[PDB]
């Protein structure tokens, strides 16, 4: 009532494309416990790296690393299907417990992070200034990650549907789609959003037949 | 949302 223990900065993890995803917001009062279910980036992915982050930048690398740990033992599955529940729990003593749990296998790994870890009083004020200073740039980085992840979904989903479609797809549509996927995959290697979007545009324009078959099944 | 290895 005259003081609050608060988090001066956001806490969370690295997600696909090197984004800091927040679990406990800035200026949250302790104690607190937030959880969020995530999944695998890759088919038949057997493990996840939980990279614990402090700060307000959208790029994971522009934030303070509080440590990392692995959860192993993820049974073969398509990407996006496993349920990995991540829990950030800060107690009365100011200690952060991060758990990751495979909701299928029951398996769990934690890291514990001293109240004293992370950025000191300067570096916080500094970190805040950079967040406000780089709101534009961080926003542009977010949009390229989102675009990359939309491009890769279109990529990976179109390949599946081609395999699922076999002889249904007129060879002439296959040729055009295969060339667009090769070109989209190439563009996703790069940093030019416009070009990713252009290969996505091209894929949609040659796939209209593939999409009918897929819907039908 | 997805995590890499």
């Amino acid at each position: 009532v005259l003081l609050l223990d608060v988090t001066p900065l956001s806490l969370g993890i690295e997600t696909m494309g090197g984004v800091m995803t927040t679990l406990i917001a800035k200026n949250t009062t302790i104690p607190t416990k937030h959880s969020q279910v995530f999944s695998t980036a890759e088919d038949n992915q057997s493990a996840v790296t939980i990279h614990v982050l402090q700060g307000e930048r959208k790029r994971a690398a522009d934030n303070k690393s509080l440590g990392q740990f692995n959860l192993d033992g993820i049974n073969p599955a398509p990407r996006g299907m496993p349920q990995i529940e991540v829990t950030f729990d800060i107690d009365a003593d100011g200690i952060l417990h991060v758990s990751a749990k495979d909701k299928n296998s029951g398996k769990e790994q934690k890291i514990t992070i001293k109240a004293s870890s992370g950025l000191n009083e300067d570096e916080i004020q500094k970190m805040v200034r950079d967040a406000e200073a780089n709101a534009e740039a961080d926003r542009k980085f977010e949009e390229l990650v989102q675009t990359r992840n939309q491009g890769d979904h279109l990529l990976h989903s179109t390949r599946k549907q081609v395999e699922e479609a076999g002889d249904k797809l007129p060879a002439d549509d296959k040729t055009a789609i295969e060339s667009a996927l090769t070109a989209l995959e190439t563009a996703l290697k790069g940093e030019d959003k416009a070009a990713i979007e252009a290969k996505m545009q091209e894929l949609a324009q040659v796939s209209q037949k593939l999409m009918e078959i897929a819907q039908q099944q | 949302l997805r995590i890499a290895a």
Side-chain angles (χ1 to χ4, degrees), chain A residues 2 4-29 31-32 34-57 59-106 108-113 115-124 126-131 133-138 141-159 161-166 168-215, chain B:
Chain A
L2 293 189
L4 289 183
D5 281 94
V6 308
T7 59
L9 298 174
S10 292
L11 299 161
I13 63 153
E14 180 178 329
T15 57
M16 198 166 69
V19 164
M20 172 171 182
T21 309
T22 290
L23 262 294
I24 303 183
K26 182 195 203 269
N27 292 149
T28 298
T29 88
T32 188
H34 293 272
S35 57
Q36 183 170 337
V37 183
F38 300 83
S39 190
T40 40
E42 219 86 343
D43 289 334
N44 186 42
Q45 183 173 331
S46 70
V48 301
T49 299
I50 308 302
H51 183 203
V52 181
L53 302 175
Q54 189 182 35
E56 304 299 332
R57 298 280 245 124
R59 209 181 294 265
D62 304 336
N63 287 301
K64 173 48 153 186
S65 169
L66 295 182
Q68 71 177 328
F69 69 94
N70 295 349
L71 182 60
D72 261 71
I74 307 184
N75 292 317
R79 66 194 212 171
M81 299 292 305
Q83 290 163 256
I84 307 304
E85 167 199 285
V86 179
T87 310
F88 281 50
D89 184 325
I90 316 196
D91 57 20
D93 298 331
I95 307 138
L96 170 58
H97 315 253
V98 176
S99 71
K101 174 188 295 171
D102 186 335
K103 257 148 133 249
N104 164 238
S105 74
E108 183 161 11
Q109 294 277 327
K110 301 168 61 162
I111 189 165
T112 313
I113 295 154
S116 53
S117 292
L119 295 186
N120 83 57
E121 304 206 10
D122 263 81
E123 303 175 318
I124 289 158
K126 175 212 203 319
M127 161 63 67
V128 175
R129 287 190 292 121
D130 301 2
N134 304 277
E136 185 196 25
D138 285 9
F141 157 78
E142 209 149 61
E143 297 180 333
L144 162 53
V145 172
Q146 220 211 321
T147 302
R148 252 217 216 73
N149 299 332
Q150 283 161 20
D152 191 71
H153 169 83
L154 228 72
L155 181 59
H156 179 287
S157 261
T158 305
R159 280 173 176 165
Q161 290 151 358
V162 157
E163 213 149 3
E164 170 74 357
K168 281 156 201 177
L169 188 56
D172 265 46
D173 297 56
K174 204 190 198 223
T175 293
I177 288 167
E178 297 264 56
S179 296
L181 291 174
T182 295
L184 169 46
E185 192 199 8
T186 300
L188 279 165
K189 286 199 205 293
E191 300 300 341
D192 182 350
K193 152 173 158 164
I196 288 165
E197 273 174 331
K199 303 320 191 186
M200 284 172 69
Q201 190 165 279
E202 183 189 334
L203 195 56
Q205 286 170 339
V206 300
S207 287
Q208 164 172 0
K209 178 70 213 185
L210 208 214
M211 296 297 90
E212 278 179 56
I213 300 172
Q215 134 57 30
Chain B
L1 294 173
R2 321 247 174 121
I3 308 161

